[PDB]
Amino acid sequence: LPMVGPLALFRFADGKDIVLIFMGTVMSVAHGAVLPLMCIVFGDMTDSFIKDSMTLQEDMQSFAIYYSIMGFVVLVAAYMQVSFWALAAGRQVRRIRKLFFHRIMQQDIGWFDVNETGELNTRLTDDVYKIQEGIGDKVGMLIQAFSTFITSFIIGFVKGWKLTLVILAVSPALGIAKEQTAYAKAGAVAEEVLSAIRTVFAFSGQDREIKRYHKNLEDAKNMGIKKAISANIAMGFTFLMIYLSYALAFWYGSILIMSKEYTIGTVLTVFFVVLIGAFTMGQTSPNIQSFASARGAAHKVYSIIDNQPCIDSYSDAGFKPDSIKGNIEFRNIHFNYPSRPDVKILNNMSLSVKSGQTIALVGSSGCGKSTTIQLLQRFYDPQEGSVSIDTHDIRSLNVRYLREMIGVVSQEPILFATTIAENIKYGRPDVTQQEIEQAAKEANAYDFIMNLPDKFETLVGDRGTQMSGGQKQRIAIARALVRNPKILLLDEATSALDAESETIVQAALDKVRLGRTTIVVAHRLSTIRNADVIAGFHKGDVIELGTHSQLMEKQGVYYTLVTMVPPVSFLKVMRLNLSEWPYMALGTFCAIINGMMQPLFAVIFSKIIAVFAEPNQEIVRQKSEFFSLMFAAIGGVTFVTMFLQGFCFGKSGELLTLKLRLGAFKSMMRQDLGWFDNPKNSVGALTTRLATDAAQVQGATGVRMATLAQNIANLGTSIIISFVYGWELTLLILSVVPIMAVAGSVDKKELEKAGKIATEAIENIRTVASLTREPKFESLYQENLHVPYKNSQKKAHVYGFTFSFSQAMIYFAYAGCFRFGAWLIKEGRMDAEGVYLVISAVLFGANYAKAKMSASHLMMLMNREPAIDNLSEEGQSPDKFDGNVRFEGVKFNYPSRPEVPILRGLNLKVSKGETLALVGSSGCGKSTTIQLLERFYDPMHGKVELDGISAKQLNIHWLRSQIGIVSQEPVLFDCTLAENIAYGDNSRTVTLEEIQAAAKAANIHSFIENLPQGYDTQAGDKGTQLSGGQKQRIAIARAILRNPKLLLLDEATSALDTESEKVVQEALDQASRGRTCIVVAHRLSTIQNADRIAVFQAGVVVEQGTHQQLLAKKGIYSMLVN
Known about the structure:
Shape: globular
Number of strands: 21
Number of helices: 37
């Protein structure tokens, strides 16, 4: 909303840019003055023809020369205007991009914590591009339009005072978004369905969601047709006003001719310039809006470009002592996160360490261990306390020297999207390959330097070969090693590694730890096998120091706890709109009517100018009144037919949009969940696709047919009129015709690559700051943006050339055709009326690709029909579920990632009412077996059988019905509590009494009352943000309503607060009575009262048995009890 002054927008103006902008403005002024001057000479030639009707050759030669000079000057002025403004825009944008990225790099880390990486990325891309296009091209066109308006008004004042007063007195007559609301409700229910599609599919709720979307779509269709009728009525009234302006202006011209004060040329001139001024104002409004938006974005980016961090990374101050012993001391550190200063994490920390003194930090998770690591890197400046390096304050030390002095290994190793070469060279700007060999050997990655297929040029990153955790950690260690660090900062360096990876990584850490002080953080004894001093960072505080022996003598509780796209055809697109036969025909009829009427408007124009030469007052008065009435009548018929066309096409398009949206939603519900795994199938992307592509398809069919009919009618009618009016009219009209295509015609991947490099830098801002390699990324950004500047400059030059050629060809065709028709009349092929008619008529009268690709997307979306069918009704419906489950030899790979086989020969049995809990490792894919049970995916190997019946042969709806599911993240819909709870059963009507009786089993009966007296709270989740345990409880109640035979639990204990644990467990126990129940969880609480246990690893059942049984067998579960 805040916006910056227009003068400040160009504040990055050097001398060359100032000269360029001056030239652009002074050429736009010339163009704007030129066009009304063409109007003046139009009036003069009209007067000359009027005189000839009652000597023409010399006047015509002079007029043709005037027109040719006018074309030359408009060509030069337009080219220099557009090219110079675009070049100034390019220079300004290059400067803005460079300074913006430089300041972003210079910005503080806390500033990066407050803001978001995605917000900064969309800033750097969209705001910069908006500034570019807006400032350059739109201020150019704005200045030109303003100049045209000014010149028109000054000529109006010069020629006729009284006429200008007449226009001013008529101007009071000229003086005299809920579709977004409808589609907002529609998109609200669409997002509620798609985002929470797990629950919708889990309850066979596609039917009622289809019904609700249908109702919202009917409301949206009504609101859209109303808005279309309003907009097209407004446009028709506008055109009508122009036509009565024609009529009244010509009536007034007739009365002046009766008074013999203003000649016909003068009145035509003033009328034309007034109308062109009004048209230019209408055209300059949208670019004014665009400039306003551009200046808003300019303020939003200038808030950053005008800033300085409290800890300047490029500060020239601070000391640079060459001699560093390696002391690191913290005294009385009090600090809280600038992101959330309310919560204190560090209060009076005190810990010292000498040179070469290995020290480790041990404590609870998120107790502030990483805060000291960030602090010593100057990530934040503590409010109090002293943090000294060899009796030298870090504040009094240059930050570049400090960060180059310390080598930091991150908990998550990450590699920049480029080759291995500089990814390891980033230690120092200067390197010799021998140092690279030494570091590679030192990092234990030398085994892989040739095991990788290529040489030291392998493209490593997301786009390149996907590395492994061990390899990434090793290369990160090498990258740190290249700097020859003196103090190593290892924050949770042991993570996301296999056992052998852990051993080799720790060996590398012990090799590098020699002769180098280190403040190491880890949760495993591997780093404490040799740690000299241990620091108990507990409850956000230090407890004591000492070696492992002293800590053992003093309540070693920590160890005790850790002891162990086909483009469819146009006919195919129209086939979707076949049902609108009369609407299509009527729209085409009105389009043909407009195409008929426009040339007839031109013809009556020519006729009235022809009769204006008669030297008889009665005849001219009668003819002027008759033709003014004819002009009013044709304006009225245009209004009627255009409003009728607008209504017809709007309703046809809205019906097509409704049909397409409902078909897309039906396909969406019908298709399986696996398709949604692809990142291209995000909920927001699909919703915006629905909206934009439906609108584009309706526009495609309707507007395409309308404008094709209208344009073909215009061209045909003009060709026939020209042909009957004599030869040569078709000839020069076809010579003119090609300019219209160019007039209507009116590198970004390199910008995308630059934005990718950016997103890498900002997303890794802590890492790239830890290496003081911001200048290297700045240089890479410069090199990447080098080419886009050049392509933009060349494209701008081409744009200017083609624009000027369009204008120059318009003027040149005007003059040449007029002169050559003058030779025709001199010989006598046709009278002056014919050339006047052709000139006026033709030379002032007269998104689909995106829409087509939208139609192709929607068409392909309606024919996928995956292997797993959810809305399918074919199959079998067993009379009663027997409560038995069997998995035999099921092998599986995730459809979104077929490179990681999850399930390998899994086998399991489940009997009636048999409690079989499922436990195992985290993230191995235990939820995949539940998704298999719900038939969310197709098992390509093995079989899943229920009560002696396989999943393939039974109806999917029956399977989804007789089942239960409790998602780990409960979701509630935007409606009353009664509807949300009744969502459990849809195949039968729900009554309030049974709903209450069954919801009493969840023990939420009392809690529903603590809200508006209607216990079926309409808000649900509108303003009363209910607690997470309460949402979990109501989700369980929803999953319990149908008393399903077999129960599936998806991490009920996960993400559950301890307060609601007792009530949730009680409700689940009451639910798990007398019926088979399958639970996956990481908590032993439900496992205590469990008949059978199944323990999983990497996608196989490794052992089976009961709690006490498996404890007796001393199995893998026994080692996993911890």
